[PDB]
């Protein structure tokens, strides 16, 4: 049996996700349209920028994240943003297509769309693979949400200062996830391990993205196409 | 009778305008769509950003602008960009509507559209008035192009260094314009004066815009919506 405050953490985390996840993908009509040079860079730059603001809204509602000093909140967001975006994007990923179906027909990004945004297959191979791995875990909503919160509250990120306080939070998060799986997820004897390995894979994707982004942002004809928030979060300042 | 090199300057300037003015306004479908908060800020930010790249392409083809040191070319563009955009936008302005008709129906910006982009009527009044003034001058293509080149080559802008070299160019430009009007524009006895007064009005619009932009860019929820080139050109660096 799960605890009362353990249940409170799941309830507040699920709600945070519902407030920051638009199941209708309707704000996508407000981005710069897809094209198919780097034809898909503008639309996917706007996608990432949009998603960063959702990830900040989610983080602001994680219990206790708000109580960290503003520096630490920046250091965690600056380094985990891309990982939480890869994490939440599983919701729109489909094993049936091997693409991300975000509502309408023009907002379905398969693998060839994403190469036209300036990224090579040495990022997209590990990325698509990661998504079918995470999709095969058939995670409950409660687990998908907890995994994002635990990826955010990692002390071992560049620039964090209160390693101890952030570590408390993250451990409080994995107690809940271990209890939840063990008590509410039949056949999850190995699932929590499979999820921690997913965080490991995410770190590897972060590196690959950070390398390919560095190349994309040192040529101004491309960084031009990026948004100010994307430049800020992925900038090295 | 106009001179040979005078005619060469008009020919090369008209061509520069044709290479950097899309009479089909077709790249407007590639901007963030209009909405009607600051609903029109994204689309009009993308409009200005687009136009800045056209103004740079035009400048790069003004005879002798290319031969200025890279600093001076930046100082002229950073201060005159908005004036050349107000100047070229006369082409899409219509006395019949009092709006800017840029091809399709959603790219027709009347005065209420432009207030939803974070600007007050103390900029839009002098702006719309300016446009019907410039529109009533029925300028030849040759004159409209020369006026942009003369607004660009003004030495009295912040940060210019070779005041003498830039002043040579600008005077070479007004000799052509005075000769052209006097020789090819029937009933232009007063027209060149009316055009120099238009440059004066442009300086006043520049100030008003620079004041309202400063307010818009000190609040990050709005500067966020701007593009990197717009931040750079209108930034104070």
């Amino acid at each position: 049996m799960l605890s009362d405050e353990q249940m409170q953490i799941i309830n507040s985390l699920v709600e945070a996700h519902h407030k920051t996840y638009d199941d209708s993908y309707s704000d996508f009509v407000r981005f710069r349209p897809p094209v198919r040079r780097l034809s898909m860079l503008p639309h996917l730059a706007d996608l990432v920028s949009y998603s960063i603001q959702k990830v900040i809204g989610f983080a602001k509602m994680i219990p206790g994240f708000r109580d960290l000093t503003a520096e630490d909140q920046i250091a965690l967001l600056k380094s985990s943003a891309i990982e939480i975006i890869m994490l939440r994007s599983n919701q729109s990923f489909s094993l049936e297509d091997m693409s991300w179906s975000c509502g309408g027909p023009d907002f379905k990004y398969c693998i060839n769309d994403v190469t036209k945004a300036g990224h090579t297959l040495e990022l997209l191979e590990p990325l698509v693979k990661f998504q079918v791995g995470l999709k095969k875990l058939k995670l409950h909503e409660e687990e998908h949400v907890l995994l994002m919160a635990i990826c955010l509250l990692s002390p071992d990120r560049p620039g964090v200062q209160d390693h101890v306080r952030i570590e408390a939070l993250q451990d409080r998060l994995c107690d809940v996830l271990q209890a939840y799986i063990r008590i509410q997820h039949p056949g999850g004897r190995l699932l929590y391990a499979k999820m921690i390995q997913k965080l490991a894979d995410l770190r590897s994707l972060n590196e690959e993205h950070s390398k390919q982004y560095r190349s994309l942002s040192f040529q101004p004809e491309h960084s031009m196409q990026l948004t100010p928030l994307v430049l800020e979060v992925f900038g090295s300042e | 009778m106009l001179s040979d090199e005078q005619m060469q300057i008009i020919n090369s300037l008209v061509e520069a305008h044709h290479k950097t003015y899309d009479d089909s306004y077709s790249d407007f479908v590639r901007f963030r769509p209009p909405v009607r908060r600051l609903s029109m800020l994204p689309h009009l930010a993308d409009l200005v950003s687009y136009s800045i790249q056209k103004v740079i392409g035009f400048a790069k083809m003004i005879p002798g602008f290319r031969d200025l040191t890279a600093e001076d070319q930046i100082a002229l563009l950073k201060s005159s960009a908005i004036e050349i955009i107000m100047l070229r936008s006369n082409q899409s302005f219509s006395l019949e509507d009092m709006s800017w008709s840029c091809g399709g129906p959603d790219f027709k910006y009347c005065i209420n559209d432009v207030t939803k982009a974070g600007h007050t009527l103390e900029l839009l009044e002098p702006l719309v008035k300016f446009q019907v003034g410039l529109k009533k001058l029925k300028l030849h293509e040759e004159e409209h192009v020369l006026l942009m080149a003369i607004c660009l080559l003004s030495p009295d802008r912040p940060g210019v260094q070779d005041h003498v070299r830039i002043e040579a160019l600008q005077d070479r430009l007004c000799d052509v314009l005075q000769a052209y009007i006097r020789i090819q524009h029937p009933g232009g006895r007063l027209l060149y004066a009316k055009m120099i007064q238009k440059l004066a009005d442009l300086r006043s619009l520049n100030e008003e815009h620079s004041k309202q932009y400063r307010s818009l860019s000190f609040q990050p929820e709005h500067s966020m919506q701007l593009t990197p080139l717009v931040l750079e050109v209108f930034g104070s660096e």
């Binding site: 900040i56 503003a70 909140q73 | 990050p220």
Partner: peptide, 10 residues
């Protein structure tokens, strides 16, 4: 340093 993030984080 980080103008936008500071805003978004209230």
């Amino acid at each position: 340093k980080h103008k936008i993030l500071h805003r978004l984080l209230q």
